[PDB]
Amino acid sequence: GMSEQERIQECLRKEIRSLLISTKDGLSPQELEKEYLLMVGNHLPLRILGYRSTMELVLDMPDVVRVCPGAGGTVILKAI
Structure with missing residues (x-):
């Protein structure tokens, strides 16, 4: 159950x-x-995982994704 979710x-x-x-x-x-x-x-x-957007998802994995800036405050997502 909890093992399957993990x-x-x-x-x-x-x-x-x-x-x-x-x-x-x-x-x-x-x-x-x-x-x-x-x-x-x-x-x-x-x-299904309780996220409303991609940003919500990636902010829940700060050990996987680095939130980097861009032009006009735009976000570029990079692997860690």
């Missing part, structure tokens, strides 16, 4: 890190949800 959390964390590692200089939160659907073949599991 393995969902581990699987997504590994998927996000793998996506951000494969890029040159990170992705915007919007580019990451697009890329996740394209490369994983499923949408980010936001609703």
Whole structure:
């Protein structure tokens, strides 16, 4: 039960890190949800994990994703 949820959390964390590692200089939160659907073949599991957005998801994994700035306060997400 709780063990199954931990393995969902581990699987997504590994998927996000793998996506951000494969890029040159990170992705915007919007580019990451697009890329996740394209490369994983499923949408980010936001609703089922209690997230309203990609930002909410990535802020819940600060050991996996680094929140970096850009032009006009835009966010670029990078793997750690």
